[PDB]
Amino acid sequence: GNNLVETTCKNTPNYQLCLKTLLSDKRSATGDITTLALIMVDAIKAKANQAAVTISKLRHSNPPAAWKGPLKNCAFSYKVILTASLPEAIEALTKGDPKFAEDGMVGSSGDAQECEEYFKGSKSPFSALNIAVHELSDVGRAIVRNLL
């Protein structure tokens, strides 16, 4: 009945991405802004999990020499995102000290971009996933700022 999802999303760097992402989770029907923020973190986590297994699969197949280094570095980037950054954000949102969730979002946004950049010609074999993690993370940072 209310338009909190719409207006919260207009207050982010990517309205349509924010809108489609939040609406995909049933908690957005009645959730307050902290809940919308947790939905967004789960969306980043889903994309980050897909990126980590994608990287493992590429390394499992004996990647070409040009990708060995970037893939190992990206594997670390996603280990940090999934083990430290997103868990820190969930904990901060759940405990009511959201300013710490903003920090994890800045981190995952930067790390996803840095991973894409590790490849020559700057484009990686999973650019869509890195871009999604980056974009969803920036939407998440903006949603969190509302709670501050």
* CATH code of 85's domain: 1.20.140.40
Largest CA distance in the chain: 55
- Please indicate the experimental technique that yielded this structure: X-ray
Q: What would the DSSP string read from start to end of 31-55? A: --HHHHHHHHHHHHHHHHHHHHHHH
Resolution in A: 1.9
R_g of the chain, CA atoms, integer Å: 16
The CA distance from 61 to 82, in Å, is: 23
The CA-based angle 13-18-20, given to 5 degrees, is: 145
Query: What is each CA distance from 23 to 5, 37, 53, 58, in whole angstroms?
Result: 8, 12, 26, 32
Q: Print the domain residue range for 112.
A: 1-148
- Tell whether 42 is in a known binding site: no
Other CB atoms closer than 10 Å to residue 7's CB: what's the count?
10
- Tell whether 47 is in a known binding site: no
Total domain count, the chain = 1
Paired tokens of 42: 């789960």
The CA distance from 3 to 12, in Å, is: 15
